[PDB]
Design an enzyme around this catalytic site. Sequence first.
Site, PDB file in Angstrom:
ATOM      1  N   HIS A  80      58.565  23.671   0.108  1.00 37.04           N
ATOM      2  CA  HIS A  80      60.016  23.317  -0.035  1.00 37.04           C
ATOM      3  C   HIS A  80      60.549  22.177  -0.773  1.00 37.04           C
ATOM      4  CE1 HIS A  80      61.678  19.932   2.303  1.00 37.04           C
ATOM      5  NE2 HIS A  80      60.626  20.000   3.149  1.00 37.04           N
ATOM      6  N   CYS A  81      61.600  22.245  -1.529  1.00 35.88           N
ATOM      7  CA  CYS A  81      62.335  20.900  -2.028  1.00 35.88           C
ATOM      8  C   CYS A  81      63.894  20.744  -1.468  1.00 35.88           C
ATOM      9  CB  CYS A  81      62.378  21.096  -3.535  1.00 35.88           C
ATOM     10  SG  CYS A  81      63.353  22.078  -4.393  1.00 35.88           S
ATOM     11  N   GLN A  82      64.829  20.150  -2.402  1.00 38.60           N
ATOM     12  CA  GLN A  82      66.094  19.936  -1.801  1.00 38.60           C
ATOM     13  C   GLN A  82      66.818  21.367  -1.563  1.00 38.60           C
ATOM     14  OE1 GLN A  82      66.962  16.588  -1.090  1.00 38.60           O
ATOM     15  NE2 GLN A  82      68.619  17.865   0.208  1.00 38.60           N
TER      16      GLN A  82
END
EC number: 2.8.1.1
Length: 105
Positions: free
Chosen positions: A60-62
């Site tokens: 995941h990222c933002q």
Amino acid sequence: TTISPHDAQELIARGAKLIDIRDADEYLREHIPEADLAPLSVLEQSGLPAKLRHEQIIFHCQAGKRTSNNADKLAAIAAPAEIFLLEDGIDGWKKAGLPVAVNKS
């Protein structure tokens, strides 16, 4: 290969690694408690360390943008795992009402 926050929870309950590809400053500000930090640039340089490998790996990222735009890199970095991308990133996780750890000052 994109996964909902609820479905990611189920995988994590079965030992899946959740990997946050953001930077340390972002992680320290707010992260998913189960997540292991491994910034994308570090992964690009020296690869996924053995300790973060598992049969199932969720990145995941933002907001889902960095994971979507680097899908091919991430597929290689975590090979030969079953690899998932968290839908809408930590923002998606928050929208789904799942817990986050927020720096208290």
